[PDB]
């Protein structure tokens, strides 16, 4: 019997999607500097 | 060598030794996790005759 699930491995998904969400989040904050 | 490198031998050895029985918690999932963790504690590195 497997010790742990092979998917969807929440921890791996949180970091990958958080980093992607962080990258676009940086762009949103980046693009508002010259808007003022 | 085949017996040394086999997963089954490691599992049956760990299940028999006293190093693991005294570390049992009583929860099936925890015991399985501990056994699987201690399986990887034994690593077999095959040798090469070319490099002696």
């Amino acid at each position: 019997e497997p010790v742990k699930r092979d998917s969807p491995r929440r921890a791996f998904l949180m970091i990958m999607w958080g980093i992607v969400g962080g990258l676009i989040g940086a762009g949103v904050a980046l693009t508002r500097r010259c808007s003022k | 060598v085949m017996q040394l490198a086999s997963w089954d031998t490691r599992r049956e050895f760990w299940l028999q030794t006293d190093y693991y029985k005294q570390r049992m918690v009583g929860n099936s999932k925890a015991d399985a996790a501990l056994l699987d963790e201690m399986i990887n504690n034994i690593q077999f590195i095959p040798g090469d005759f070319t490099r002696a």
Partner: protein, 36 residues
């Protein structure tokens, strides 16, 4: 590279990108029914 200014260009021109960008998908959609 003024990415901050660039984001306002597509934000104001979002109608143009959506207007004809989806047209390309519609163009290829009929191509599916035109093929084996």
């Amino acid at each position: 590279l003024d990415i901050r200014g660039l984001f306002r260009t597509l934000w104001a021109g979002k109608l143009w990108i959506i207007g004809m960008g989806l047209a390309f998908a519609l163009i290829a959609l009929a191509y599916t029914f035109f093929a084996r």
